[PDB]
Amino acid sequence: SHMFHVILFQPEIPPNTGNIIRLCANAGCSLHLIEPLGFELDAGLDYHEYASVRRYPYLQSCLEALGQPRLFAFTTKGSRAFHEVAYQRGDAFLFGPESRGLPEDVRNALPTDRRLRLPMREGCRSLNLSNTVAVTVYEAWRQLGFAMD
Amino acid sequence: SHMFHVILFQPEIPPNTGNIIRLCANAGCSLHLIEPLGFSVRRYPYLQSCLEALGQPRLFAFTTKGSRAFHEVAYQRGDAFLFGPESRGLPEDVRNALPTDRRLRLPMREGCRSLNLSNTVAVTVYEAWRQLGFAMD
């Protein structure tokens, strides 16, 4: 059983996903990838991290397999800072691809208060995707005492 | 003028540094590399010269050997954060030159390897930044 579920929508850059696998193993998250991926799921990682990663043809297929978890989408076009939420066990965190970000139809399927953004300084480049996932997951984990369950 | 100072001790992998540059620019951090490398951003020959050039700020080091969880510190504007390399980690004599209550660890599941270097920096800086209300100053 996993504290949180990380969902990467059409990830493109192999080392980002590799770093995210390591993050999820450390924090106790499950990892789900929505096809098509920009790379083949073949770098430093073990078996008990790499073998639990799941792929799905469509985002809805993933959400159905997860039992329709509480879902947050992390997007610069987000109405609300990510740290304002009170996260809880079983929450799912949805991130867009490195070069495109989430489709409009995916983002708008969520309530306005569940489209979240990290604090960005105006004029700056985007954060690297795996850094964004790590900061999000550790904020949610911090709110739960860093419990290992 | 920079809220925090990120100090990388002998960083090895370039992509981590590209990620960390972007993280620091967003959080308002300066970036400092202690030479030698393997590939608001400056380089230094040894650690004390960076600390001096920075005005000797409060210094925390982030390590698995850490005596204290990173989220238990109350961070302040001007704090400096020291991270060891990807391949072998902070030298023993560098880490032991910090007070015990300033050698911090990120929460680790048993039997897990450390986070990527740039992910460790990202989580550390954003927790400090969160404590300061994510002020852009």
Residue numbers in the entry:
A (entry chain A): 4 to 45, 52 to 158
B (entry chain B): 4 to 42, 61 to 158
Publication passage describing the model:
To produce a protein knot without open polypeptide ends, we chose the highly conserved bacterial RNA methyltransferase as a model system, namely YibK from Pseudomonas aeruginosa (PaYibK). YibK contains a trefoil knotted backbone topology. PaYibK also shares 65% sequence identity with one of the most-studied knotted proteins, YibK form Haemophilus influenzae (HiYibK), but contains only one tryptophan.
We first determined the crystal structure of the wild-type PaYibK in its linear form (PaYibK) to confirm the same trefoil knot structure and the dimeric assembly as found in HiYibK. The root mean square deviation (RMSD) was only 0.6 Å between the crystal structures of PaYibK and HiYibK, indicating a highly conserved higher-order structure among YibK proteins throughout evolution including the knot structure. The N- and C-termini of PaYibK are separated by ca. 8 Å in the crystal structure, which is sufficiently close for the head-to-tail backbone cyclization without disturbing the backbone knot structure. The root mean square deviation (RMSD) between the backbone Cα atoms of the crystal structures of PaYibK and cYibK was <0.2 Å, confirming that the backbone cyclization did not perturb the 3D structure of PaYibK in the folded state.
